[PDB]
Amino acid sequence: MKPVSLSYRCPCRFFESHIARANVKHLKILNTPNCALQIVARLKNNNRQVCIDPKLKWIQEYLEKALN
Amino acid sequence: SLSYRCPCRFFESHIARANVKHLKILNTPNCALQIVARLKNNNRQVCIDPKLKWIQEYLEKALN
Numbered sequence: 415m416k417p418v419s420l421s422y423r424c425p426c427r428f429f430e431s432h433i434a435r436a437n438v439k440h441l442k443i444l445n446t447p448n449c450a451l452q453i454v455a456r457l458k459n460n461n462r463q464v465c466i467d468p469k470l471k472w473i474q475e476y477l478e479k480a481l482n
Numbered sequence: 483s484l485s486y487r488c489p490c491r492f493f494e495s496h497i498a499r500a501n502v503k504h505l506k507i508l509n510t511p512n513c514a515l516q517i518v519a520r521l522k523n524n525n526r527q528v529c530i531d532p533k534l535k536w537i538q539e540y541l542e543k544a545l546n
């Protein structure tokens with residue numbers, strides 16, 4: 415890959431839509447206003463980081479509860 | 483587990499949006515503290531106050 419310092423490409427090119435809450439170690443919420451996909455999940459069973467659908471069903475409630 | 487350590491035990495209350503690279507929201511619903519920031523300037527990760535007003539707006543924007 416192009417190193418970060420040089421890349422103008424939004425980090426998330428594509429999202430995945432079938433990530434279950436139970437397999438998520440954390441969601442990383444990137445501070446990238448200019449890009450459509452800001453949410454990256456780190457997964458528990460494989461430790462991949464996958465960009466996820468921000469409309470995934472469980473995401474909103476998971477985020478709101480973190481803040482209570 | 484009684485074994486299980488919550489990754490965040492203490493938080494910073496004075497972190498502003500501009501000094502954050504990203505937030506990590508830890509899937510540890512059991513724990514009081516679930517919010518981590520990687521800092522630009524430092525590159526340290528710190529746990530941050532979850533009642534920080536800007537955190538809400540930050541997360542809502544990410545969801546659109």
Ligand SMILES: O=C(O)C1=C[C@H](O)[C@@H](OS(=O)(=O)O)[C@H](O[C@H]2[C@H](O)[C@@H](NS(=O)(=O)O)[C@@H](O)O[C@@H]2COS(=O)(=O)O)O1
Nearest residue numbers: 433434435436437438471472473475476479509511512
């Ligand atoms: O809607 C959810 O966030 C959710 C639904 C499911 O019961 C489960 O996810 S799964 O469909 O991927 O299996 C998960 O629910 C619970 C879950 O039992 C625990 N979280 S998890 O291990 O990461 O999956 C539990 O401690 O909290 C989840 C619900 O959130 S809560 O508000 O803290 O109770 O997620």
Ligand SMILES: O=C(O)C1=C[C@H](O)[C@@H](OS(=O)(=O)O)[C@H](O[C@H]2[C@H](O)[C@@H](NS(=O)(=O)O)[C@@H](O)O[C@@H]2COS(=O)(=O)O)O1
Nearest residue numbers: 418425442444445446454456463503504505506520527
């Ligand atoms: O905008 C960002 O904050 C960011 C963008 C990159 O896509 C990401 O790459 S990475 O997650 O594979 O490393 C970058 O690096 C961070 C990342 O937030 C964290 N990884 S984690 O430990 O699983 O959460 C971070 O804590 O470590 C990475 C730093 O990379 S490094 O400088 O080359 O060592 O985050």
